[PDB]
Design a protein around this ligand. Sequence first.
Ligand SMILES: CCCCCCCCCCCCC/C=C\[C@H](O)[C@H](N)CO
Ligand SMILES: [Cl-]
Ligand code: NA
Ligand code: NA
Ligand code: NA
Ligand code: NA
Ligand code: NA
Ligand code: NA
Lengths: 242, 57, 244, 296
Amino acid sequence: GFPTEPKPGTNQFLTTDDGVSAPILPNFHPTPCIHIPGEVRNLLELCQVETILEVNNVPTNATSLMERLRFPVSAQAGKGELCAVFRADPGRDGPWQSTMLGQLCGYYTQWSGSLEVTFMFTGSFMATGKMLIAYTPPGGPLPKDRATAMLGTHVIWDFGLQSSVTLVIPWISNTHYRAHARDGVFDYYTTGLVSIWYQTNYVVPIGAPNTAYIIALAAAQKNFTMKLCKDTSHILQTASIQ
Amino acid sequence: HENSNSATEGSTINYTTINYYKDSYAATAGKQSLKQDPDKFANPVKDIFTEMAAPLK
Amino acid sequence: DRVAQLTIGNSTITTQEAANIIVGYGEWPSYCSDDDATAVDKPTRPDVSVNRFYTLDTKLWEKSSKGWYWKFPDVLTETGVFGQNAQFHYLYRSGFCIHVQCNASKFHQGALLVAILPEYVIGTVAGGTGTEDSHPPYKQTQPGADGFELQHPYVLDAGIPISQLTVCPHQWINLRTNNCATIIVPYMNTLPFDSALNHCNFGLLVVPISPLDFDQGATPVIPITITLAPMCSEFAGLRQAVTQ
Amino acid sequence: DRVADVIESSIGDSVSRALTQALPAPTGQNTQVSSHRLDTGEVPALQAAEIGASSNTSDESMIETRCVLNSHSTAETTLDSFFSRAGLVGEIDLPLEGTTNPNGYANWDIDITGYAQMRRKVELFTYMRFDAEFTFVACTPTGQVVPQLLQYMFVPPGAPKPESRESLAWQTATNPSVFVKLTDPPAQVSVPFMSPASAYQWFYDGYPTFGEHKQEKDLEYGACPNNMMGTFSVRNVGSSKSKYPLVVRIYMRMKHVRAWIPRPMRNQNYLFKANPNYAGNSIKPTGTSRTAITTL
Ligand SMILES: CCCCCCCCCCCCC/C=C\[C@H](O)[C@H](N)CO
Ligand SMILES: [Cl-]
Ligand code: NA
Ligand code: NA
Ligand code: NA
Ligand code: NA
Ligand code: NA
Ligand code: NA
């Protein structure tokens, strides 16, 4: 026969190897493919769809799970009080875990690109107010007050007919890609911090609720990309599935 | 020639695969076309609006 | 853009506080191609008698409501001429125009998430411990027009997060902004036609993400009404009327 | 000659009017230079989430940006890149003594819903059409490779399932079979898309048959026959008991993948195969929690 010489790797079964395999059914023809709505071509299509960000990931009670989906805002004392805070890191344990983006990230080792968070005010029509959403790039410790938070990337949000506002977390990194940030050494890939402050105050007339809620929705921008597939950190199974 | 029985037969996407058998579903996964349609899920609005505009007029 | 009118059949819907219209997956309902079809018998396309707005029961939004859902081919199977055709014919196909309406005042507040979840399979709490393989009863998987209330909205009674339910055609009803949600859904299934009785193509979920609230004195009864209209309805495989 | 509402009628239009188009996107979008903008009338930052559409605000309109020529590939997030990775979907035991297939043969009901990793990924979509590559890794419970000859047989629904090691069904006059020794590299084979539907459904919200749906038959809810591809049978090619205990792990790699309608990703632990049941007393949050909303 034709002189050959097998090399290392012979007989191995590489999970991700893309080769040819003998077909079990000769001349078999699959059922025609009808037209079906909502076909997906690339996962990045899903990373751009906003899903609810659990900024208020505090309640763990059985009856209080639905309230992690929104955080409160109310009449204050007028000293630029802090409202909420959270890390901007997408593939890190925290608020982003409730989003589709955060979930898809779990399947990739690295990501790159700008992120965006849209805040929707669900108070009453008579309620007014201005907030200051700030994004603090790496190195900046959690701003102690508004006067410190406003020194970074931010946006002053005015409640009105347009219920929502979008905070764009621009891609400000030293490296082209970021691996998932965790506590310790990998905190090198942290994205930064987001913090909502009262620019002025939540004002309301007599007869209207003194407390309203905000719902945060998060997704990725058009320049967002991911690479190097891996398995999500969690496996939803304890014993064999029956 | 060869049987056209792969799951992606008649798809508006091009593939570069390798095969050694007469049944094309045995071919490698290959490389594919990188087209995307974000709007299908992210902006499925009937009357599209600009980003410069106030969504609700 | 805040005002709109939806006319189809002999029914018209009006609104002055809308938030545009969503067209599920960027596709309008359409009839079945001659190459996507298999059933050889000529279908019935009743048009105006079935493609119109049907208004199902009204729900009351309370400060403690969890949310409700409706399976769709189902909600209409016992109503009007659409129901008759769905019962007499084996095969059914159609899209829908769903209009959820709920108004309050400039002093009330709250936000409802109105979404469409295809193949909305319901799960059970598995006896609490998770060792009992129990299944949802017919009354819960196909609740009819009265809809059904969610027991664990956080997981949509199916072990999946509601926080991600927005990857599905949806819209919100934020009382300070709009008083209705309009979603147009095309026929979605892996088959060109299917039974309107055994299969429910999708489910409509109306869930309060931001609790309803108001001061004592403002009207406390805030209803949520569901109006829906089939589109491009086609039926085939005629026989006697079957209820289930 | 013909009524006007029939001529101008549009009933019959089989072409789906699409509001969106798929554009080429081999790399991440670039960033263009941006300058300050102090004007009224134009508000990129203000949105209305009620509409149901994601914010279309771009980096350029929120801050003064530089020009960045992004050449990061989007190839690794295609469906094939994501799903074309072999993962465990089945595990068959052929022990010497026990109550689990102790007669030298086994019948595995083809269902990739028995393992969490693979299952969670595919359940990200409602419908999926694809060809697959099955690999069978066999050995003893200690991982030891033994000189034993096995026979794997695909039994499509309707074909006779073997009732013993010496069953007549092992003649495979028509069913596809594979004969391998555990000393040979794992058997690998290509499978087409064999559903009578246009795609497999990880979720079927309905019943398979008509009639009254009583308590006793709620077992059938969510069961779609278009996903039931048959059985996978294994045996010791012989007429006597094998000298060793065996295990067969089945791996699946999807190829030529099409997928439709994305869904929320599994939130709770899986409990059973044919359904999405969850432990009602152990409903855990999607993720991690903290003490206060104002502290990291
Ligand atoms: C020796 C020859 C062995 C041949 C084995 C061929 C196996 C073909 C398997 C096709 C499996 C398709 C699985 C798809 C869907 C799942 O079964 C359902 N979601 C379960 O509910
Ligand atoms: Cl991260
Ligand atoms: Na091979
Ligand atoms: Na069509
Ligand atoms: Na805008
Ligand atoms: Na965006
Ligand atoms: Na580019
Ligand atoms: Na037998």
